[PDB]
Design a protein around this motif. Structure first.
Motif, PDB file in Angstrom:
ATOM      1  N   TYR A  58       0.817  -1.205   0.000  1.00 11.05           N
ATOM      2  CA  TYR A  58       0.000   0.000   0.000  1.00 11.05           C
ATOM      3  C   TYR A  58       0.859   1.266   0.000  1.00 11.05           C
ATOM      4  CZ  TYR A  58      -3.841  -3.130   1.316  1.00 11.05           C
ATOM      5  OH  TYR A  58      -4.800  -4.112   1.336  1.00 11.05           O
ATOM      6  N   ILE A  83      -3.891   4.161  -1.965  1.00  8.48           N
ATOM      7  CA  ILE A  83      -4.942   4.684  -1.098  1.00  8.48           C
ATOM      8  C   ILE A  83      -4.950   6.184  -1.295  1.00  8.48           C
ATOM      9  CG2 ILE A  83      -5.694   4.965   1.302  1.00  8.48           C
ATOM     10  CD1 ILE A  83      -4.184   2.362   1.935  1.00  8.48           C
ATOM     11  N   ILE A  91      -8.544  -1.963   5.566  1.00  8.19           N
ATOM     12  CA  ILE A  91      -7.736  -3.027   4.977  1.00  8.19           C
ATOM     13  C   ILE A  91      -7.911  -4.293   5.826  1.00  8.19           C
ATOM     14  CG2 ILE A  91      -5.342  -3.786   4.583  1.00  8.19           C
ATOM     15  CD1 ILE A  91      -4.723  -0.763   4.025  1.00  8.19           C
TER      16      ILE A  91
END
Ligand SMILES: [Zn+2]
Length: 357
Positions: A58, A83, A91
């Motif tokens: 991420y 994100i 998540i």
């Protein structure tokens, strides 16, 4: 010296991908600083991603875009998830063997002027923690971050893992970003406006991080900045259009082969020495952190080192006074230094009075 894992959520790994981080349930990358990417393309990480299929990386949208331009990181393509900034996002973390389910909400906050750089706020069932990555914010910027607050007050933050690069009282004050930028701008303007043959070399060693400097200089002066490589910005026109791989420009931020010593440099890295057989009139400007004690006054951000050479105040990191202000405001239970200037002993102790523990 942050080794990837926060005590509160050991199953996530941030800005460290080797050793214990090979067993992460999720990965996070704050920015494309080389020192935050240790192990990120190691064979042992690739080995582990092949045998653990629901593990994701991420990062910010910009960081994802930057990463996917590099051939050596394209093995991540299916498993990098951006994100959006200041958009709390749930998540799920999967135990590959035992089937433990773990849910966490992550919020990405701006960290400063490096493209795609973020802080990560994590909220889960073991408290709220903040990982800053490398950061330097504007005055009051953290206070204005609504997603750091609940009901008017700052969120109850258990631990802050922060950039303590200059966490010592001797680094008390660093000139502001605006002061640094204005200084360099006016120096460059005063040179390149003399003639088309007056050129500046910006001596910036890292491949990533100085793009906001280049774009501001380019925007204000109507010149593209020479760089070694700009393909990472292929889909980022607001950065891309201020840069060029063509050496026929008055502002250069090209870089020598990294192997070479500073004392061996005799010309612009790209080798242009003249135009129309008129020698180029070159000054060198080296971004360099400058600081001042608590009881001192700031002096000029531009420091002349020779007839044709200058240093210019520049910082990727908060001053000690800025660190104190940040932590005083956040008032966490714990503050953990990500960087040792000394030992985790002077610095952990320097930060102790700002914390509730
Ligand atoms: Zn050049």
């Amino acid at each position: 010296s942050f080794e990837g894992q926060m005590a509160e959520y050991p199953t996530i790994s941030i800005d460290r991908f080797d050793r214990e981080n090979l067993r992460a349930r999720a990965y996070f990358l704050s920015a494309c600083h080389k020192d935050h990417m240790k192990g990120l393309r190691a064979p042992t990480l690739k080995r582990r991603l092949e045998c653990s299929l629901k593990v994701y990386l991420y990062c910010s949208p910009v960081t994802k875009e930057l990463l996917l331009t590099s051939p050596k990181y394209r093995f991540w393509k299916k498993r990098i998830i951006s994100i959006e900034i200041e958009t709390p996002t749930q998540i799920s973390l999967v135990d590959e063997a035992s089937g433990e389910k773990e849910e966490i909400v992550v919020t990405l906050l701006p960290a400063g002027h490096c493209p795609g750089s973020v802080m990560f706020l994590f909220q889960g069932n073991n408290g709220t923690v903040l990982y800053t990555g490398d950061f330097r914010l504007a005055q009051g910027e953290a206070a204005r971050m609504e997603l750091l607050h609940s009901g008017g007050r700052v969120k109850d933050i258990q631990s802050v893992y922060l950039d303590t690069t200059f966490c010592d009282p001797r680094f008390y004050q660093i000139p502001s970003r605006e002061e640094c930028l204005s200084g360099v701008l006016e120096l460059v303007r005063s040179w390149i406006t003399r003639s088309p043959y007056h050129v500046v070399w910006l001596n910036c060693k890292a491949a990533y991080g100085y793009e906001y400097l280049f774009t501001n200089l380019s925007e204000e002066l109507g010149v593209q900045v020479h760089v070694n490589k700009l393909d990472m910005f292929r889909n980022m026109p607001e950065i891309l259009h201020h840069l060029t791989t063509d050496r026929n420009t008055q502002i250069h931020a090209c870089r020598h082969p990294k192997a070479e010593e500073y004392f061996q440099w005799s010309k612009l890295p790209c080798g242009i020495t003249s135009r129309n057989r008129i020698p180029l009139h070159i000054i060198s400007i080296k971004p360099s952190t400058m600081w001042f004690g608590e009881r001192s006054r700031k002096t000029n951000v531009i420091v002349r080192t020779g007839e044709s050479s200058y240093r210019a105040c520049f910082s990727f990191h908060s001053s000690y006074s800025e660190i104190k202000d940040f932590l005083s405001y956040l008032c966490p239970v714990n503050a953990y230094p990500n960087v040792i200037p000394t030992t985790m002993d002077k610095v952990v102790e320097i930060l102790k009075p700002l914390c509730r523990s």
